[PDB]
Design a binder for this molecule. Sequence first.
Ligand SMILES: *[C@@H]1O[C@H](CO)[C@@H](O[C@@H]2O[C@H](CO)[C@@H](O)[C@H](O)[C@H]2NC(C)=O)[C@H](O)[C@H]1NC(C)=O
Ligand SMILES: *[C@@H]1O[C@H](CO)[C@@H](O[C@@H]2O[C@H](CO)[C@@H](O)[C@H](O)[C@H]2NC(C)=O)[C@H](O)[C@H]1NC(C)=O
Ligand SMILES: *[C@@H]1O[C@H](CO)[C@@H](O)[C@H](O)[C@H]1NC(C)=O
Lengths: 48, 33, 36
Amino acid sequence: STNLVKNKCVNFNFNGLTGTGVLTESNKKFLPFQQFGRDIADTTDAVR
Amino acid sequence: LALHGAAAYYVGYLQPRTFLLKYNENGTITDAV
Amino acid sequence: QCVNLTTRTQLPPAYTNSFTRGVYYPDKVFRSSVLH
Ligand SMILES: *[C@@H]1O[C@H](CO)[C@@H](O[C@@H]2O[C@H](CO)[C@@H](O)[C@H](O)[C@H]2NC(C)=O)[C@H](O)[C@H]1NC(C)=O
Ligand SMILES: *[C@@H]1O[C@H](CO)[C@@H](O[C@@H]2O[C@H](CO)[C@@H](O)[C@H](O)[C@H]2NC(C)=O)[C@H](O)[C@H]1NC(C)=O
Ligand SMILES: *[C@@H]1O[C@H](CO)[C@@H](O)[C@H](O)[C@H]1NC(C)=O
């Protein structure tokens, strides 16, 4: 594992899920049994 | 059950259905069709 | 040891209606502000 870098476009791997993008702090509150958040187009837009 | 008191229990059976669930802005299911 | 309970009055079964009950979360993905 590496360090977490924010506000820059970065290739990322979270628990095996890979992608590209910019990471920002979120106000969403996940229930304890969930790990990913998905929007209307079904793509992952939030992560614990 | 337990023995020595007021209790009432209800039983229903599930079927395969299609539901339309509603998620509010906090992520909780508040309504369904 | 097992004991067969006696002194129990027998009554016909009763039925009622479920008013939009029994909904659970189908999966473990967070969603907000959406019809799914
Ligand atoms: C409670 O009643 C049941 C009968 O419903 C008894 O079970 C019977 O036991 C005898 C002797 O062991 C068997 O020949 C029957 O086949 C059994 N019936 C059933 C339906 O299983 C049971 O023994 C009673 N419990 C007591 C007396 O403590
Ligand atoms: C709920 O299910 C029960 C069981 O099928 C229904 O009870 C039957 O109702 C019919 C018509 O009233 C009677 O002819 C049967 O004899 C009833 N069966 C029993 C075991 O009582 C009941 O009507 C259904 N609906 C409601 C609202 O109770
Ligand atoms: C959503 O969360 C906020 C903040 O905790 C709360 O005030 C509100 O009552 C919750 N429910 C709805 C429907 O907004």
